Amino acid sequence: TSIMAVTFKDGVILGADSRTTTGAYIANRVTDKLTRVHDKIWCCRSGSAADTQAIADIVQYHLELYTSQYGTPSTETAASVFKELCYENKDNLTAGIIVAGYDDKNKGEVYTIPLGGSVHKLPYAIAGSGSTFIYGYCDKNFRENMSKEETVDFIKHSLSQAIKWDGSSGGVIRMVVLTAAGVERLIFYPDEYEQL
Amino acid sequence: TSIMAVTFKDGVILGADSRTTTGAYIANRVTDKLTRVHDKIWCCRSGSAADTQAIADIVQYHLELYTSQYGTPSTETAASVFKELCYENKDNLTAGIIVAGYDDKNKGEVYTIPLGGSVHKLPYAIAGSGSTFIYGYCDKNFRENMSKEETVDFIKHSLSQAIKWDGSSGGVIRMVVLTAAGVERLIFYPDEYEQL
Amino acid sequence: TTIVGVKFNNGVVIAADTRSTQGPIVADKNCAKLHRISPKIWCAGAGTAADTEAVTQLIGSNIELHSLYTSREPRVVSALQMLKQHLFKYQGHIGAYLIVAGVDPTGSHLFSIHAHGSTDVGYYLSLGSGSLAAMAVLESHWKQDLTKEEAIKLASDAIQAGIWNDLGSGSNVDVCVMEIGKDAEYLRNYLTPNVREEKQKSYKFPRGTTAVLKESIVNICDIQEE
Amino acid sequence: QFNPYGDNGGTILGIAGEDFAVLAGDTRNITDYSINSRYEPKVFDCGDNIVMSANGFAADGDALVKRFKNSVKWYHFDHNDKKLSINSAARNIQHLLYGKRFFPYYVHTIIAGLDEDGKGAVYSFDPVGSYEREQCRAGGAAASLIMPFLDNQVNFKNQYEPGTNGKVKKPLKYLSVEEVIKLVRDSFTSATERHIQVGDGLEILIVTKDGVRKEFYELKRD
Amino acid sequence: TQQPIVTGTSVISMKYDNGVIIAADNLGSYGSLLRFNGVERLIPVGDNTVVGISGDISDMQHIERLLKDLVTENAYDNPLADAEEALEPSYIFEYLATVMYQRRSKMNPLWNAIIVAGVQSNGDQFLRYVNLLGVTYSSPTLATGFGAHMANPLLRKVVDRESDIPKTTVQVAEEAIVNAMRVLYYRDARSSRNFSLAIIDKNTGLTFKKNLQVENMKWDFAKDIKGYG
Amino acid sequence: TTTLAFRFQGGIIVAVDSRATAGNWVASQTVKKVIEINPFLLGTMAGGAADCQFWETWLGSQCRLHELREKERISVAAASKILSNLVYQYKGAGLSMGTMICGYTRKEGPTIYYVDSDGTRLKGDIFCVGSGQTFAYGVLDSNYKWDLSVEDALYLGKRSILAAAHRDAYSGGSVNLYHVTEDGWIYHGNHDVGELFWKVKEEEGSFNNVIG
Amino acid sequence: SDPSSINGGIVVAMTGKDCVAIACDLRLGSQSLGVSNKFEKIFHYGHVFLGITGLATDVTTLNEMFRYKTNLYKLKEERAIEPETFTQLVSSSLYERRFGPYFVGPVVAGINSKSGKPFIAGFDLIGCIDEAKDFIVSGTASDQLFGMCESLYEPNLEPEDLFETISQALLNAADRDALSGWGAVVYIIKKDEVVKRYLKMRQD
Amino acid sequence: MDIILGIRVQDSVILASSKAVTRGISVLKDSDDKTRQLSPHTLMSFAGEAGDTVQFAEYIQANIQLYSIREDYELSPQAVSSFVRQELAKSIRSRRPYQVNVLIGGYDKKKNKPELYQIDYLGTKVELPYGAHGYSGFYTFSLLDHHYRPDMTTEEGLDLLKLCVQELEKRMPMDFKGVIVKIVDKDGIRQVDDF
Amino acid sequence: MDIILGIRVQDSVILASSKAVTRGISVLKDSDDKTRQLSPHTLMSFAGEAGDTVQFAEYIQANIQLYSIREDYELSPQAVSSFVRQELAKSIRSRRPYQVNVLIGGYDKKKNKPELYQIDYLGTKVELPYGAHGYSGFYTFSLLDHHYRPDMTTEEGLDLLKLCVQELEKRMPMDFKGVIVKIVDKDGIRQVDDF
C-alpha cells in the first residue's frame, strides 16, 4: 500500500492505492483509504488498518470540537494532536499517517508522521512500501508550484512504477484534490495509468 | 553499496560506486569492486566482500583453463561457473554477483546471479542497497541501443539519487567500458554529478 | 468455515454452512453461525465459537438499549463502530471475526470486522478457511445490480463450492434473506446435500445382555408433607 | 525450517476372520481441510495373497512399499519360489522401520493375509517398530474411533447372554464374508460424518485362497 | 538445509477427453519484490510432457539441466527407439520423485511443487503430482498453492468424476482454463497479467500459446464503493 | 506395564501383563510381553517394546551360535552380558529397554540379570520393572521367601499381577504364568485378570475398598 | 498437556423418548495412581443434571458455584430451574474467566418441565452452546464414543432399548481407554423417576 | 519423602507422621513434629514445600479455633475439611501458589465415627478408608486392600503399620527416622509412643 | 550410591563401599557391593552414573590382569593408579566421558606400605592419609582429621570407621544401607568379620 501527497500551485493533491491485503491474498481491492477527518484536512493511511483507524477516529472527534470551541484547526495544530497519540503508542501500535491539508491561506502543506511520531513539514512526501522505487524518480521531477493538469499526471506515473515492482501496491488510484474550490474526488483505473 | 550494468548499441558499460561502510564508520571510501576475471568479462561485487572476493578468484582460474584447452569463454559460460558455486553454497555464502562480459557477436550481455543463484539475462541490472531507490527511475528512463555518451550520463543520473537516498552509497563512480575497442576506464568525481 | 455475503437491490443475503467442528472431529452437524444483533441486522461468526457468542450477546444488548432510547432502529454503521471499539480494547486477544450485514432505512450495508479491529467494505465479501474458495465463485459471476433471485442462488452456489474443497464446510446451509422494511425470511436449510443411510444390520440387543452389580432407586422430589 | 514429516490422514482397517481377511481404506487424501486427492488408492497388492497399506505419512509409506516390492523378487529367486509367508513379510517390514530408529519412520502399517494354517490373520505395526498378531485392528487417528464398534458386534466383549446378567459370557461367533463387508461399510459411513479423514470411496481388497476380489462403494463428499 | 529464497506461484491443469491442459503465469518473484516478471515456469520436454515447476527458480534450473541430460541418456543405446522405451510422462515422473525423496532424507530438499502433465504412449492422459515432501497423487483436476483453493473448485464443477472426462471437450476445457486464470490475477497479487498456455492433445501434439493477456478487469465494483468517504 | 520376577528353590516364576498403551488410550491388550529368546530363556518387552523385541531377536542368534560352537547350554550370565554390551554402545539411539533375562541352570542356579538401556547390568533375587512395579512390590515382598513352596509361588505370581493391574492405569490385559524350570521354561496358561478379580473378591473377602 | 488430560475421565449423554440417559465412569485417577473407584462426576440440582469432566479441583469449585447460582434462582423466581436456562448460564460463566480459563467440559441434561422434551447440550472450555440431540460426548475418549454411538444410534428410544445402547457404548469404550475403568453409574430418568444403576464390568 | 500415611480402621483413624524434617542436603533436625491439633478430635498432618507448610499449618489452626469458640461447638471434620478445600482453591490460583498437601483424620463426634479426608494441593476432597501423600501411597494402596477388612481392630492396624513402614524404608532410598503415631478417636487425641 | 570411603592406617588400607544401588526413586538392590578385585592386594571401589559404572570397572580389571599375567610380575600399586588416571584424562577430552570416582587401595607388598589414592572424576589423583568422594565425604573429613593418628592399628582403624558410619546415616536423608568393609593388607583381601 503505497500512498503519497504532492503540492501544486493551487494547493495539494493526495493520491493513494486502494488495496488492503492479507498476506499475498488481496483481501479487498476497493477499500477506502483517503479518509475525512475534517473538511480540508484529509489523510493517507499505511500500516495496520486497525491501529491507524483507532488514532484517526479519536482525532476526528477532536477536530470537530477544536473547530467549534477554539476556531479552525491548523494543519500544524492538527498534526500535533495526531503526533501525541503516535508518540505514546509508538511501540504499542505501528501507524504511519500522512496528514495533509490545504489552507486557502497557506496553500498545500504536507506533514508526515512516522511510526515513532513527529511533525515534519515537507514540500511533498511518499510512504508505504513502494515509496522506495520512486524516491529517485520523484526527486528529479520535482517542479515548483506545478500546473494542476501536470500534477495529476505526475502522481499517476510515480505510482504506476510502484505497482509493477510491488504487488501490495495496486488498485485504483483515488485522489482528492484539495484546492480553494473544495474537495474533488478523482478516480483512475489501471486501464488509464498502467500503460503510461 | 550500489552496483549496475547497462547494455547499449556497441556493448555494455559497467558502473559502480566505491564506498563501503562497516557499521556507521566508513571503512574505505575508494573500494575497488570492478574485478577482472577475464579480459572482457568483469564482475561486480556486492554482499559480503569477503565471500564475493573468494568466489571471484576461484572462477577466474577456471576461465583461464577453459580459454587454454577448450577455447575462449563467452559471457554465458562464465555465468554458469559463477552459478554452480553460488548454488550449492547458497546458504553459507552470500553473493550478489553481476557477471557481464562483451562479445563482439552479441554485443553487451548482462547476467545477474542473486543470492539464490540463478542465471537471468537482463537488458540492464541493478543490485545492492541502492537499487531499491532507483528501481522505477531506471525503468522509466531505459532505452535500448542508445549512444555510448547517453549510457555514461544515465549511470551518473541514477547513482546521484542513490547517494541522496542512501548514505552508504557514494565515492568515485568508476567504470569499465567494454566495447570492441578494448577496456577503457572512466572515473567521475562526486563533485561533478552530485551538483549536476 | 465458509460464509458469504452478497448485495441485491431489495436487501442483502448472507448465508453460511452449519457443519461446525472442534478439531478434526466434527463436533456438530448443525450449529448455526448466524447470530441476531437485531431483527434486520444478522451476522455470522468465524474464528472460535465461544468468541463469537460472547461478543454477539454483548453488542446485541447494547444496540437494543440504543434502539429504545432513540425510538428508531439504529444504523448498520452504528453496529460497525460498536464492534470495532470493543475488540480494540482487548487488543485482539479475543479474536472474533464477523461478517456483519443488515438492512436499515439508510439502505443495505456490508462490512467486515476482525480480531484487532481491521475492517473491509465492499459490495461482496467472504470469510473463513474456505473464503478463498468462495471468492472464486463470486468474481466470475458477479454483476452490477444483482436481483434478489440471482444473488440468493449465487450465494448458496458459493457455499456448495466451499463444501467440496473445504472439509470444515459440509452439511446444511442456512440462509437469512434480509429485505429492507420487511420481516427477514429465514430459508433454513435451503440446500441440504446430506444423505443418511441407517445401519444395514440391526444393532439392537435383547435386554439383560449387560451385566449389573446392584441397582438402587433415588428421588429428587421434595420430601413428603406427612 | 522444513517440515520433518507430513501427515496425509486416512484410516485403514485389517480384520482377521477365520477364512478371509480384508484390508479396507478410504481413498480421501488430505493435508489440512483441503482435499489433495479425492480418488487415490492406498491398499496395495504385494502378492501371494498379502495386502499392505502403510497409512499416515504417505511419502514414508511409498518408500516402504517400493523397497518391499524388490525384496519379494529376491525372496523367490533364491529360495526356488518358496511361497513368501505372511510372517516372513512381517519380519521384513519390522526391519525396514527399525532401519532408521534415530528419526523413526512415521507410518502406522497393517498387512493382512492368511496365515499358513489358513485362518485369516492380521499383523499390525506400531511405528516404533514392534509387531504382533492381532484380531482386529484399525489404524490411524480414527483407529480409536472405529475399534469399540467391532468389540461389541463380533468380539462380544462386555456382552453377556440375555437374562444371566453377567454369569455366562456371549461366545464368539464366526461371521460370513458378507456380514463383515456390511460392518466395514457402516463403520466407515459413520466416520464420514464424524471425521474429515474418511470419505470419497471405500475401496476394499479381500484376500482368500480363492484369489483376490475387489469391492468398491462410494462415500459422500461433504 | 535448503530454505526458500526466490519464489514461484500456482499452476492450474485438468484432464479432458483427448489430452490434457497445463497453464501457468510467468513469474520469478523475489518475495514482495516482483523482480522478474517473465521467467517462464513451464518447461516442455518434447511434445510428450510439459512439466510445471513452482517454488524456487534456482532449483527449476537444477532440474531443467537434469532433464536435458536425461534426453541424451535415453538416446544412448538403441537409438532407433522413438516411442518404445523412449521417455513417457511416467518415466520422467518416477525419476523426479525418487531423487526428491532422497533430497528430503538428507534434510535438505529441492524446494518445489511440481505437476507433470502429458500424454502416455497408450494415449492415456497423465496427470500426477509430486512436491518437496513427496506427496504423490493423481486426480482429474490438479492445482497447487493458491490455485488449489481457488481455481480447483471451478475445474471440479466440470470434471466432477471419471465419467465426466469424456464429456469435457478440449474446447470447454480451453474456456475453462483461460477464464480461471483471470480470477487468479484479480485477487492474487503475485499473478501477473502475462501468462502462458500449453495443450498436449493426442491428435494435434503440442500447441503452445504464449504471452496471452488477462483483460476484462472489474472496476465496475470499484466505482460503486467509496467507503466512508 | 508391570512385569515381575522372583527366584526361589523351585526355580523362577515370571508373570506378565498384556496391556500396551499408545497415548492415553489402550492400543492393545494382546502384546505378549514374553519373548522366548530360546527354550531356556525368557526376556521381557518391558521398557521400550520395539527396542526389546528387535534386540532379543538379535540375542536369539548369539545364543544359537554359542550352543553350536561349544555344544553345551549357555550360562544366563554369558547371554545377558552380551546384551548388555551391545546396548551401552548404542545408547543415545532412542533406546529405552528394560529386561529381565530369566534362566535356571545348575551352573549358577536360578539367575536373573536385569539389563537396562544405559548398559547397567544388575543381579538380584527379586526384580520388578514397570510403571506399576510399585504396587506389585507390596504383595510380592511379603510373601517372598526363598523357601516359599512351589505351589504357593504359582498363586503368588497371579496375585502380584492382579494387584498391579488393578491400580495402575497402564496395566490390564491378561496373566501369562511361566515357570523357569531346570530344563527350561514351561507355559502355565493364559488367565484373564478381569475374571480372576471376581473369584479372588469372593474367595478371601478381599477387594472391600471396592464398592460392595 | 492440558490439566484436564492428566486426570482423564468421561461423561456421555444420550437421548431417548421423553427419557434420558446420562452415564459416567467412577474411576478418577491421577495418571498411574488410581485414587477412587467411586468419585462421582454426575451431580444433580433437581432434575437438571450436571455431568462435569476435566481438572479435579476445577470440578469441585464449579459444582459448588453452580450450586450457588441456581440456589439464588429457585428462591427468586419461586420455581425450579429449567434445563434451558441452565445451559445459557453455564456457558456465560465459563467465558467470565477467559484468561486463567476453566479446564472442564460440562454436559447439561434434563427433561423440560413444561415442554416434556428430552434435552442435552455441550460446552467448550470457555463455554458455548453446542446443540446436537443424539449425543454429547466428552473427555479424553471423546472420539471413541463419537464413532461408536453414531453406528449404533437409532432414534427416540424407549427407556429399555436406551439402557442397553448406552451401557454397550460406555463399556467397550472404557476398556479401550487407559484412564477410564473402575465401575460405572447410569442415571436412567424415565420421565421424573430416577433408577440409579451401577454396572458390573470386568475390573482389571 | 517426609511421609504422611494414613489408614482408617473400624473405630478410629491412625495417622503416621515422620519425625525427620530435611531442609535439603542435610537433615536439619531429625526429631520434630509434623502435625498440629485443630480441634480436640480433629487432627491435621501436613507435608509439602519448605516453610510454606509451617506458615499455612499455623494459620489454618487459628481459623478453626476462632470459629469453634464462636459457636461453642468444635467444627466437625466435615466442616473442617471443606474449610481447608476452600482456602486451597484460592491458593492454587494465587499470584504466588501455596502447595501443601494434607490428610485430615478426625472423629466425627456428632455421628460417633472416624472420618478420613484426603486433600491434595489443588484441592479435591474425598472421603476414603485410606489415602496418602508422596510415594507412600503407590506401594501401599494395594498391600492395604489385601490385608484390611472392615472388621479389623485398631490394635491390628498398628502391627500392620510397622510392616508397611518397613517396606517403604527398604524400596525407597529415603528413610523417615520412623513415624510418631497419633490416634484420633472418641476419647480425643492420644499418643502412641511405641513407634 | 554417592559415598565411597577410604582410610589408610599404619599397617593396612581399609575400604568401605556402599551396598545400595538406587536407580531413580526405587532401591532396586540393597546388598550388592560396588567394588571389583583388581589384584589380591589391590581393591577398587567405584561410583558414578548408570552404565558407565559397570563398563569402566570391568575394562580396568581386564587391563591390570593382562598386565599381571604377561610378565608374571605384580605391578606396583603406584603404577595401577597412574593407569586409571590416564584412561580418564583421555575420556574427558573424548566424544564420550566416563564419570566414575574411584578409591584405589593397594598394599605394596614389598615396601610393606599401605597406599590410598583418591581419584575423583576429573582425573585428579592425589595420595592422601585419607579420602572419600562425593558430598557425603564432607561430613566425615572432620572426624578423620581429628582422630586420625598414624599409630592407629588396623583394629583402631575399624573403630573410627564405625563412628563415621553412624554420622553419615544421621544427617543423609538417603541411607546407603550400610557398608561392606574389606581390608587390603599383606595377608591379601579379606572381608571384616562383622561387616
UniProtKB/Swiss-Prot annotation, chains A, B:
Xref: SUPFAM superfamilies: N-terminal nucleophile aminohydrolases (Ntn hydrolases)
PROSITE patterns for the chain: PROTEASOME_BETA_1, PROTEASOME_BETA_2
Assembly notes: The 26S proteasome consists of a 20S proteasome core and two 19S regulatory subunits. The 20S proteasome core is composed of 28 subunits that are arranged in four stacked rings, resulting in a barrel-shaped structure. The two end rings are each formed by seven alpha subunits, and the two central rings are each formed by seven beta subunits. The catalytic chamber with the active sites is on the inside of the barrel.
Source species taxonomy: Eukaryota, Fungi, Dikarya, Ascomycota, Saccharomycotina
GO biological process assignments: proteasomal ubiquitin-independent protein catabolic process; proteasome-mediated ubiquitin-dependent protein catabolic process
Enzyme class: hydrolase
GN (gene name): PRE3
Reaction catalysis annotation: Cleavage of peptide bonds with very broad specificity
Protein name per the record: Proteasome subunit beta type-1
UniProtKB/Swiss-Prot annotation, chain E:
Cellular localization per UniProt: Cytoplasm; Nucleus
SUPFAM superfamilies to which the protein is assigned, alphabetical: N-terminal nucleophile aminohydrolases (Ntn hydrolases)
CDD domains noted in UniProt: proteasome_beta_type_4 (cd03760)
Entry's Gene Ontology cellular component terms: cytosol; nucleus; proteasome complex; proteasome core complex, beta-subunit complex; proteasome storage granule
InterPro entries with a match to the protein in the record: Ntn_hydrolases_N, Proteasome_beta4, Proteasome_bsu_CS, Proteasome_sua/b, Proteasome_suB-type
The keyword Phosphoprotein appears for this protein: no
Keyword annotations: Cytoplasm, Nucleus, Proteasome
Keyword Nucleus among record annotations: yes
Record-linked Pfam families: Proteasome
Gene3D superfamilies reported for this sequence: Glutamine Phosphoribosylpyrophosphate, subunit 1, domain 1 (3.60.20.10)
Single Gene Ontology BP annotation: proteasome assembly
Biological role: Non-catalytic component of the proteasome which degrades poly-ubiquitinated proteins in the cytoplasm and in the nucleus. It is essential for the regulated turnover of proteins and for the removal of misfolded proteins. The proteasome is a multicatalytic proteinase complex that is characterized by its ability to cleave peptides with Arg, Phe, Tyr, Leu, and Glu adjacent to the leaving group at neutral or slightly basic pH. It has an ATP-dependent proteolytic activity. PRE3 and PRE4 are necessary for the peptidyl-glutamyl-peptide-hydrolyzing activity.
UniProt record similarity statement: Belongs to the peptidase T1B family.
Note: Present with 16900 molecules/cell in log phase SD medium.
Protein known as: Proteasome subunit beta type-7
Source organism of this protein record: Saccharomyces cerevisiae (strain ATCC 204508 / S288c)
Lineage: Eukaryota, Fungi, Dikarya, Ascomycota, Saccharomycotina
Gene: PRE4
Curated annotation (Swiss-Prot), chain F:
Catalytic activity: Cleavage of peptide bonds with very broad specificity
Location relative to the cell: Cytoplasm; Nucleus
Gene Ontology molecular functions: endopeptidase activity; threonine-type endopeptidase activity
Keywords per UniProt: Cytoplasm, Hydrolase, Nucleus, Protease, Proteasome, Threonine protease, Zymogen
Major site of localization recorded for this protein: cytoplasm
Keyword Nucleus in record: yes
Gene Ontology annotations for the cellular component aspect, listed alphabetically: cytosol; nucleus; peroxisome; proteasome complex; proteasome core complex, beta-subunit complex
Biological processes, Gene Ontology terms: proteasomal ubiquitin-independent protein catabolic process; proteasome core complex assembly; proteasome-mediated ubiquitin-dependent protein catabolic process
Binding-site list for bortezomib: A49
Active site: T1
Source species, domain of life: Eukaryota
EC number(s) stated in the UniProt entry for this protein: 3.4.25.1
Enzyme category, top tier: hydrolase
Family, per entry: Belongs to the peptidase T1B family.
Subunit annotation: The 26S proteasome consists of a 20S proteasome core and two 19S regulatory subunits. The 20S proteasome core is composed of 28 subunits that are arranged in four stacked rings, resulting in a barrel-shaped structure. The two end rings are each formed by seven alpha subunits, and the two central rings are each formed by seven beta subunits. The catalytic chamber with the active sites is on the inside of the barrel.
Note: The side chain of Thr-1 acts as a nucleophile, and the N-terminal amino group acts as a proton acceptor.
Protein name per Swiss-Prot or TrEMBL: Proteasome subunit beta type-5
The organism of origin for this protein: Saccharomyces cerevisiae (strain ATCC 204508 / S288c) (Baker's yeast)
Native organism taxonomy: Eukaryota, Fungi, Dikarya, Ascomycota, Saccharomycotina
Residues of the full protein shown: 76 to 287 of 287
Swiss-Prot record, chains H, I:
Cellular compartment(s): Cytoplasm; Nucleus
GO molecular function: endopeptidase activator activity
Disulfide bond annotation, renumbered to this chain: none
Keywords per UniProt: Acetylation, Cytoplasm, Nucleus, Phosphoprotein, Proteasome
Residues with the Phosphoserine modification: S76
TM stretches of this protein: none
Name of the encoding gene: PRE1
Family: Belongs to the peptidase T1B family.
Name under which the protein is recorded: Proteasome subunit beta type-4
InterPro entries registered for this protein in UniProt: Ntn_hydrolases_N, Proteasome_beta2, Proteasome_bsu_CS, Proteasome_sua/b, Proteasome_suB-type
Domain of life: Eukaryota
Keyword Disulfide bond: no
Gene3D superfamilies: Glutamine Phosphoribosylpyrophosphate, subunit 1, domain 1
One Pfam family, short name: Proteasome
BP terms from Gene Ontology: proteasomal ubiquitin-independent protein catabolic process; proteasome-mediated ubiquitin-dependent protein catabolic process
